[PDB]
Amino acid sequence: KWCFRVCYRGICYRRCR
């Protein structure tokens, strides 16, 4: 269970599965 959320001007998405 690896949860890593990040938002950048070039890439904005969240990962939590």
UniProtKB/Swiss-Prot annotation:
Annotated coiled-coil segments of the chain: none
Bridged cysteine pairs (disulfide): 3-16, 7-12
Subcellular location: Secreted
Keyword set includes Transit peptide: no
Any one biological process term the GO annotation gives: defense response to bacterium
Expressed in which tissues: Hemocytes.
Record's keyword terms, sorted: Amidation, Antibiotic, Antimicrobial, Cleavage on pair of basic residues, Disulfide bond, Secreted, Signal
A GO cellular-component term linked to this record: extracellular region
Positions bearing Arginine amide: 17
Family: Belongs to the tachyplesin/polyphemusin family.
Function noted in UniProt: Significantly inhibits the growth of Gram-negative and Gram-positive bacteria.
Protein name: Tachyplesin-1
Residues of the full protein shown: 24 to 40 of 77
